[PDB]
Amino acid sequence: ADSDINIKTGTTDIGSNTTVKTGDLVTYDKENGMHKKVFYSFIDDKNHNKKLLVIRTKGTIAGQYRVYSEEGANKSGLAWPSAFKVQLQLPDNEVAQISDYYPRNSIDTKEYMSTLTYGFNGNVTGDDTGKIGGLIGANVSIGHTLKYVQPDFKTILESPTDKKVGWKVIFNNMVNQNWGPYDRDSWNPVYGNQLFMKTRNGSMKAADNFLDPNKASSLLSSGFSPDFATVITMDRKASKQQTNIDVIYERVRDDYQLHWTSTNWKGTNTKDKWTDRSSERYKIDWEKEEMTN
Amino acid sequence: ADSDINIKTGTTDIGSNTTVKTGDLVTYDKENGMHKKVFYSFIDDKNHNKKLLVIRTKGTIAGQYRVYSEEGANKSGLAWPSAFKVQLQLPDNEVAQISDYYPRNSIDTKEYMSTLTYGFNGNVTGDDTGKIGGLIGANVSIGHTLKYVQPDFKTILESPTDKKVGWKVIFNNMVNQNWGPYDRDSWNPVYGNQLFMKTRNGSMKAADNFLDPNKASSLLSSGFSPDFATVITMDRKASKQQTNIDVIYERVRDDYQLHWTSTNWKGTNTKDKWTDRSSERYKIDWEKEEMTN
Amino acid sequence: ADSDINIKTGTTDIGSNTTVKTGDLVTYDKENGMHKKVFYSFIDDKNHNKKLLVIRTKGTIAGQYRVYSEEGANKSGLAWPSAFKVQLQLPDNEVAQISDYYPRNSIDTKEYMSTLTYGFNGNVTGDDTGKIGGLIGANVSIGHTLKYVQPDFKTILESPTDKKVGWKVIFNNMVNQNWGPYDRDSWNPVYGNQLFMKTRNGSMKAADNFLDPNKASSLLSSGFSPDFATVITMDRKASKQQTNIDVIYERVRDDYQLHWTSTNWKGTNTKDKWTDRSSERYKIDWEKEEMTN
Amino acid sequence: ADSDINIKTGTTDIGSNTTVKTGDLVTYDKENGMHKKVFYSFIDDKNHNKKLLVIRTKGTIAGQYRVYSEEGANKSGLAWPSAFKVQLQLPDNEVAQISDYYPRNSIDTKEYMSTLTYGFNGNVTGDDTGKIGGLIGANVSIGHTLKYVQPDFKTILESPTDKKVGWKVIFNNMVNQNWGPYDRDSWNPVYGNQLFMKTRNGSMKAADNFLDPNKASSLLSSGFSPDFATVITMDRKASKQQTNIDVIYERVRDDYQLHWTSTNWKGTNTKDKWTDRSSERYKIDWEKEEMTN
Amino acid sequence: ADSDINIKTGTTDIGSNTTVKTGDLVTYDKENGMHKKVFYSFIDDKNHNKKLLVIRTKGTIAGQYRVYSEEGANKSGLAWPSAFKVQLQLPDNEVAQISDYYPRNSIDTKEYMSTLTYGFNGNVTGDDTGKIGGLIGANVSIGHTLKYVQPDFKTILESPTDKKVGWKVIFNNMVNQNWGPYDRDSWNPVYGNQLFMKTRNGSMKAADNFLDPNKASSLLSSGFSPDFATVITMDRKASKQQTNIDVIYERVRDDYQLHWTSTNWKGTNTKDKWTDRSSERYKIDWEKEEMTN
Amino acid sequence: ADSDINIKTGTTDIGSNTTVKTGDLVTYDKENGMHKKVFYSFIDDKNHNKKLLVIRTKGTIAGQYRVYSEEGANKSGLAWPSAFKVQLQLPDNEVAQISDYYPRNSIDTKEYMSTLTYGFNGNVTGDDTGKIGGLIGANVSIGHTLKYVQPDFKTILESPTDKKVGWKVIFNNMVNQNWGPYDRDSWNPVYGNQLFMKTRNGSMKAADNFLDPNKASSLLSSGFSPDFATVITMDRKASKQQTNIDVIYERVRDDYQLHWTSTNWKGTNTKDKWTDRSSERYKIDWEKEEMTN
């Protein structure tokens, strides 16, 4: 921070004594169930060697936890969103560049603890028949413990460039009714993948044996609300003072199926079965400090 | 945040140098027991490309934990609120759009820890008759521990669009007299669903074997006080500067019954039996910056 | 909050550039031992569609943990406060309405923990007689841990309306000399309810066998000091700029009885035996911005 | 708080744009070892309906943990402060009233933890004689855990009125050399009350078996420094603008004795043996905003 | 605080609109190894009824953990600082008084938690010989645990008067090489007091068996750096505006003795063996607002 | 900090009353997949003896975790980034020097806890035949647990000079599918290094037995974003006010090999196989206060 290098806090930041022009661009893609809202801010700091544009991609991408298929009373399919993606892309012929972005990748941590314990014990015995026993034992013990946190979903910043940037919220793993946690690769030889299995040998039909959405992660059904920030820099003396930028909201759905084997239920999950891509193009006008679609 | 992208804190926020006009609209629906209060704020920032209207839905929806059917000393009914919902909706013919909202869906986490232990022990034995003995053992053990937090009720942002948004507070589970927790799908083959039974084999009237409301979550009896924020954008060049918006407060109640099977009590819970819904129509006037109903 | 919807912090709040009129009204009710102080503030924000009055009810209601009765050396009664209530009430003919209130009901939480363990062990025995033995064991375990917080008293907001609002602080449970916790419903077939029993056996008389007030919750004897906020809105165009409002402090006392069974002490608690109600009327003058009584 | 009711923070507070006149009044009572300092502040806010006077009682009441008696080599006495009190009261004929106070009584909490465990274990035995054995067990466990904090001393607000207010800091319990904790009622069949005995069997003089004040709570020896706040309101049109107020500092000491029983030491404690009281009178002048003694 | 009593934060505080005079007085006592620095500030608030002088006693008193006596490989001594003190003292004839001080005595706390578990188990037995066994067990266990923090040194405010105040930081206990802790009273029949013993049976010179100063509390060797605050009040009408004040830094050292018993070492600590005092007199000139020594 | 030495906070900081000139320099090295952004700020404080240039190296270095070689169906390589580095170098002939830098090296800590527990127990036996037994045991136990936090990657400030400074983020260890953690040196004789081995013994191609990048640290695949800051000073009277500075981004990749031994997979990792260097030169002009590349 500034104070760590003996500099007055805030001295190095941009935006002082500048008139900032903001805007809201709202769009709903009905077929894909994506409410897309772009909040941009033009920052022209006369003391900065560049012209800045801050784009915050907000809104909500519907999860759509739906039972899509039903092949009789002993087979049914459940489509669930396994990844949510947001991307901004500048045509390679533009002179604008992607300067900064947030959030970024964080370094994980884990808590480790060792334990060494040893003791002794002596027991004296006897009975009514004047018997006398004895016992002198010992023991040693070595232990290891590993603690770490497991989020249900992961927020990952995909390797960016000066002309593209993107994030993807992916499924990590979930707890099913206090047991697990199960992930996309969990496999039990008798029941297979029990990710969204309600009961292991219930008597109802396949369509009625899936975990209730209210008891799973809210992102599966309700959807995920992004909050990402991208900063675009443009040179003040560039001939072309107009830029086009593409914003893509994307959802990747897997296919989880239950089939009844006449003894118990057996799950199966197939990765990256469907992709819902919703793209839109906006025009950046650096001279007027306005953005439109 | 702005600090993370080397921008002065608060540079990109809206509302600076703007005269904000606020107001309160209070209404009580006697029949449904819903005290509704709408607090709005017109924000017209000449540096923002659109006009803003922030609507905060406040108040409280009575829980109404009640013993409704006192059908003797062997059976009785209890009606409890299993979900509370607040929904705003713009007519599809409106030009205004829903720009932002709060709270949204957060990502759940879970703490995981693995234990690996192994030790050894020796024992020397004997007695008065000169007998001697020995014992040399070993052991290994593998532990897993999963820890996470479970609220009694969930706050869920339902998939929004540019024309409607809503939230729902649903019953997750509850602890009943130091044991549990139980939920709407709990089932014990002997007693059934013990969610709201006071005593397992208590010789009183069915109307008297229900958990004391002071011992259950306060939201069941007293009611739930929403605090939601939704901001509506509007183009300054729109043809019609008046908008209509509907606000719905509704409560869904389940049906829990105690019947005595001549040894003990048996509990049964029926989902989403009743629905209480209070709807209102409000008029937004963007030119005068005032809202009425 | 405001920063979450990209709005400048504090933009939507009321009170900016307004002259606020405050006051104190103090009263002591000697019969019911209630010191009542009402602190109001008149907020007339020209940018608000209504006029505001913020009423804070403060002070303290004495507990009066008392040995009221003594029927000989074998039976004695203890009166303790089981609930403290504060209520504000507007006549239904009034045009003013109750807008907001604090504190409200909060969602409780619990912490769940699951543990799965399984190890192995082998032992090799022997003695001086050239004997040889063995042991190959296995084991599995499944643990469930539930953790949650239990306040001694609960603060509850009772379902409000546009003419009435109230709170109640009810007794939840208490720890008696490191045992328990016990509540109003605790029962033991030998000793009965041991809420305030000092000793299970004693040559002392009944009056000397009750828990020392310094060893119990300070609210039982010293008293409870409320701190509540009620906001009352009034329409500027209303014909009557005078409003009456009733403020009611109230204490409900139970009856805990001890009696000697010639072997041990027996305790019983009778719910809601007495009710100390202290009501007072204040007059609000919206034109001069002052309350009186 | 004010932000919870959509009100600009600090709008409803008193004191803005007011000239505050303060003062220090210091007095030492040598006989009781009490250093008394009274810090007052006159706040005349023309937007408040009454005058305000804020009195903070400070200083230090010496503990005086001492060995007062010495019965040669077998009995001895130790006088320790079991309670410290600070009280302010106006004559019942005064027109001023006590408006507010701090600190008030807080609600205690406790942490609960329920554990349910069940597991299985199998054993296979054998020896050199071709013997074979078996073992198949099952177990269950039901745990409870209660956790709460126990301060060495309690700060209690006595039931206040419009003419009297006071606080008392009482001895709750104490840990003696990593054992206990003991309180004023701890009793051991052979040793009695071990509150302040150094050694249970140690052969010394009675005057040398008491715990060293550096090892007990610092409030016993060094003394307790109060910090309390009281607010007195006065009507601007009251006939007489002078008020008298009495401030009392108290210390109540118990009597702990050790006697030798020819095997060990036997401790005994007698509650509230001695009371040290220091009363002082101050004059309040509301016209000049001045206080004297 | 002020916000607790509905008063604007900071309204009551002293020092508003006043010119403050500050100063430093640095002195080193070579004999006693005490670097003494006094930092005073003169505050004359025209809205305060008396003048103020804030004296901060700073600097550091060298520990001087040194092995002084060397009597051959059999015996040796170690002088260590067992207490550090700082005192301010006004001559009795002065009219100025001591008004406030910091830090003060605080109330210690502890964590108490009771546990109650009970389980059942059954074991079936058998062998090749058609033998059958059985076992039905039960158990119960009540636990108690106590948790509290122990600092190496205690900061104690000695009972103040209006003419003198003082503090003292005393040795509480210390952990020696991962085991202990040990205080000045710790005694073992074999080794005695192992406070500063490096090894139980090392065959080195007694001067070489003492704990390495880097493995002990840094205050023993490096020294203790006080930071105390004392505020002196003075009447504006006082006849004499000149005051004398004494500032005393003193260190008390104990005597730890190690001698060889031909099998192991023996520890012996003699309380309060030595005492170093460094007194200095300063002059306070209330008219010029300056202090000198 | 300043408050610790009785100095007004921020008094000794740089930047007050200065016009700061900032800039952004963005570059993308496509071959090495490095998005490099340099954010500089010129601070010319007239009260500072030298000029300042605060360089912040930001951007993202792609991880590029991928299967570089599939040597049939039982031999495959995986190239993963073991260390990421950032360097700034001033040519030896420059008069400017490196003044400060952040982050720096911090001292690690660990929690240590020594347990000592002992007990006693007695058991009385019997049977139907009149047989009587006895048992009296004693035990003792000495424990030591160590606990510390260890991140997946460690960020290290390399020994800097007045002409160059650098940082390196090195792989510490990682948990593989709830077990481990493994590092570059982990070695199991049966399976070798299991760092990125998906299954200990499956039946698939070696290219299909590597840990899924979504289950590994995000830095391995997505990349690492430096947030490193460097301060450069320059004399105002220096002969020439131009300076060249080199900025280097690096990525060192190890080589992980899987080979099938017809019983199980065997992993092996060879440290620092490859090095990716991306260097760039910038020109610093202290007169215009601008930086170019």
Side-chain angles (χ1 to χ4, degrees), chain A residues 21-245:
Chain A
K21 302 220 317 173
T22 61
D24 274 321
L25 261 35
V26 182
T27 310
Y28 183 63
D29 187 336
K30 260 151 297 188
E31 68 188 29
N32 296 293
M34 313 182 170
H35 173 259
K36 307 190 300 193
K37 175 276 192 72
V38 169
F39 175 90
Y40 67 98
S41 311
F42 279 93
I43 301 179
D44 183 1
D45 199 333
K46 249 61 182 181
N47 290 319
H48 195 63
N49 76 333
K50 236 88 167 200
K51 208 162 186 185
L52 293 186
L53 174 58
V54 184
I55 302 182
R56 287 186 169 83
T57 56
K58 315 189 63 177
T60 299
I61 304 188
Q64 301 189 141
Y65 180 97
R66 284 139 155 75
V67 305
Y68 75 94
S69 172
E70 175 164 7
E71 172 119 61
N74 298 134
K75 188 147 44 193
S76 185
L78 176 68
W80 59 288
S82 70
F84 302 98
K85 296 160 150 294
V86 179
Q87 317 170 13
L88 301 73
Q89 189 163 181
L90 291 180
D92 49 65
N93 62 306
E94 252 81 22
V95 284
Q97 308 172 271
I98 291 184
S99 173
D100 215 335
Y101 35 66
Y102 193 83
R104 319 184 184 93
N105 294 326
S106 296
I107 301 178
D108 268 314
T109 58
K110 73 200 74 61
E111 197 179 49
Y112 182 93
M113 76 185 290
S114 302
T115 301
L116 177 281
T117 299
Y118 54 88
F120 315 90
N121 60 292
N123 308 79
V124 169
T125 59
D127 53 1
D128 57 357
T129 67
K131 205 70 182 72
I132 293 299
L135 176 58
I136 297 184
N139 60 96
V140 181
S141 180
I142 297 289
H144 310 290
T145 300
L146 191 68
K147 198 181 77 68
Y148 49 95
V149 180
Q150 297 168 150
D152 287 358
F153 278 82
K154 281 187 170 178
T155 305
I156 298 184
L157 172 66
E158 280 174 339
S159 300
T161 83
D162 71 337
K163 292 281 184 299
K164 164 191 294 73
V165 69
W167 298 256
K168 57 171 181 173
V169 179
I170 66 186
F171 181 80
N172 188 22
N173 58 23
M174 197 179 58
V175 171
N176 184 344
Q177 293 171 95
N178 315 138
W179 302 103
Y182 304 102
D183 50 62
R184 296 205 298 174
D185 298 325
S186 311
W187 191 249
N188 188 331
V190 173
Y191 306 85
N193 190 327
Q194 320 180 220
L195 177 63
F196 304 111
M197 181 186 302
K198 175 177 301 174
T199 64
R200 301 164 109 141
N201 64 34
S203 60
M204 6 53 169
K205 59 168 176 170
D208 285 354
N209 195 40
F210 292 106
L211 190 64
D212 187 13
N214 293 10
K215 290 197 294 193
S217 179
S218 59
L219 278 68
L220 291 182
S221 54
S222 288
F224 164 73
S225 304
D227 184 354
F228 301 145
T230 302
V231 180
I232 298 189
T233 65
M234 152 80 72
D235 188 321
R236 291 205 172 79
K237 286 213 51 178
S239 173
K240 185 179 183 178
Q241 289 290 309
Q242 257 144 93
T243 301
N244 305 280
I245 187 182

Side-chain angles (χ1 to χ4, degrees), chain F residues 155-172:
Chain F
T155 135
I156 299 189
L157 166 70
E158 310 190 65
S159 304
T161 82
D162 72 333
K163 295 311 181 193
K164 70 184 180 190
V165 70
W167 299 257
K168 55 173 184 174
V169 181
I170 60 184
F171 182 79
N172 183 30

